[PDB]
Amino acid sequence: QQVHLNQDEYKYLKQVEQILREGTRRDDRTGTGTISIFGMQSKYCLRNGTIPLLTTKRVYWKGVLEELLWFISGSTDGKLLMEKNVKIWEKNGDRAFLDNLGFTSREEGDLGPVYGFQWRHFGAKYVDCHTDYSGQGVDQLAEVIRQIKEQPDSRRIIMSAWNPSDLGQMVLPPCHTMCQFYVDNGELSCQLYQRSGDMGLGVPFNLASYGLLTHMIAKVCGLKPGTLVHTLGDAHVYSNHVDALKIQLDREPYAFPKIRFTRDVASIDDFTSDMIALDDYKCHPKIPMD
Amino acid sequence: QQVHLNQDEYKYLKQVEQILREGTRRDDRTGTGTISIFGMQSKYCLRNGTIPLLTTKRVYWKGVLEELLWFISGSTDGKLLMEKNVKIWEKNGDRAFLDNLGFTSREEGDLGPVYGFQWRHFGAKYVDCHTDYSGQGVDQLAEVIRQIKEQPDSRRIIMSAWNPSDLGQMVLPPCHTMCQFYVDNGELSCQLYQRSGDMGLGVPFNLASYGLLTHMIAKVCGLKPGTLVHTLGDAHVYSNHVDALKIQLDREPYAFPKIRFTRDVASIDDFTSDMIALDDYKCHPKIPMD
Ligand SMILES: O=c1ccn([C@H]2C[C@H](O)[C@@H](COP(=O)(O)O)O2)c(=O)[nH]1
Ligand SMILES: O=c1ccn([C@H]2C[C@H](O)[C@@H](COP(=O)(O)O)O2)c(=O)[nH]1
């Protein structure tokens, strides 16, 4: 009999357990050991300000926060994010990595037609991360916002960052590939499709992003938040992290933190770091990954 | 719970049953009644030639067969399906329907940059349903096959029909939005994302086509079939059919039929109707009109 304070996070821990029990022992792109299950789905409750930030292992909240605003802005420049102290895109963006992919012409932090570009200018001809793109390409995020307001029962509210044409000039293919929105009884829900997922690091970071993104759009559209559906393709754990994930599994999860917005917004482009408060984020002791 | 000859189809009946018991009552695009659950996932074994053609309610197999071959060819002309007596796109590729969308310029069978165009020529400038697009756009299906053949551990094997640039010219926005492939120990698995699915008609149809597609790609790549993962956004059942479904839910599923290819194929473009054999498709009797 399993009664849990945070049922949703417990179900996540069960996902990790299930991967380790039933998962196939394949290899990585780098030749590293991986344990994988193909095709997984879990749901997280957002109903009263709740954001799915895992309490059994600390998630880089400030990384989630600054990156999402940096996504929404349509920005493809790595430096703007590093100004905010977030170094999550640093390795991919800087000189050495670019020259390895053959981007010798490219600037110091130019990431290519990555995420935010596609989100807000799909189909637009990309040149660099400084050229103004407004007016060019499809602004999906605007379209998604419009659909929610005018056609609440639409089964077509989709935002996709997967652009076959722009994959070549991309530094890193979209891991979070697309998402669909769903209005039910004044509540806004979101389903994320993530083609690849590390349960130790990547997945909990994407939960927090698309959880946050939902909350934001919910406010912009004057709706309450509903449910985050997290769907994975390759759900996996690294072979070296198995000891580390076993420590996480024995922990009883605390309640999720809550999102609070201090002011009001004109649109989705009106959000700033200082206005997204995170309340009561309690965590378990750190997990050594070395 | 209990043992079943066809554990896979039973689980589908359980999905329909879950939608009925837990699903929210909402309105359709044309003011009809649906009962809906947002975010659902199911798996279907394809090993040893098994194709998930449901047995508790006969699936229009010839439709599946002819439409998929038609997708692969890159074709987007509806008259080509009409010639094979498959009338599933008839109502959509129709003068009045096209004029209603403002496609007054259009030919009668011209459906726009729908599935087949995006699969073989993503990003190409669409003209009409008769032009030759060889060389233009990204050939995703070919890329997917190349990836499977030489990069079988890849987590980037995606083929998407969702093109925000082309949606406006589409007679209907893609329903099976995208799919991801996955190779494990010589076994090819596939995950399909459906943004909306009628459990009574569309879903069982989409199961068969992507089931079949996986079998084809496997043969082309010299691999064996694995699993089909079917992820749904708006999984729903129409209020009109609610009685017929309860009759279907009482039926014990028979064994899924087997797919048998009767000759070798040079590529994915080498598949003809006469060569795809379907063995032992035993169904339950028809249900009184839905
Ligand atoms: O948003 C992200 C970005 C990266 N990863 C991790 C998971 C995989 O280990 C790896 C993906 O690399 P590819 O398989 O896409 O090459 O990075 C995520 O889980 N989520
Ligand atoms: O491949 C398909 C095509 C159509 N539909 C059905 C299910 C929905 O009832 C409807 C789609 O509604 P819209 O997404 O067009 O609103 O068509 C499917 O399930 N699968």
UniProtKB/TrEMBL annotation, chains A, B:
**EC supergroup of this enzyme:** transferase
Q: Does the keyword Membrane apply?
A: no
Species assigned in the record: Caenorhabditis elegans
Family named by the database record: Belongs to the thymidylate synthase family.
Name used for this protein in its record: Thymidylate synthase
Record: residues binding dUMP: 29, 155-156, 194-196, 198, 206, 236, 238
Keyword terms of this UniProt record: Methyltransferase, Nucleotide biosynthesis, Transferase
- Give every Thymidylate synthase/dCMP hydroxymethylase domain span: 11-290
Q: What is its EC number?
A: 2.1.1.45
Q: In which pathway does it act?
A: Pyrimidine metabolism; dTTP biosynthesis
Phosphoserine carried by residues: 105
Example GO BP: methylation
User: For this protein, what is any one GO molecular function term?
Assistant: thymidylate synthase activity
Q: Where is the active site?
A: 175
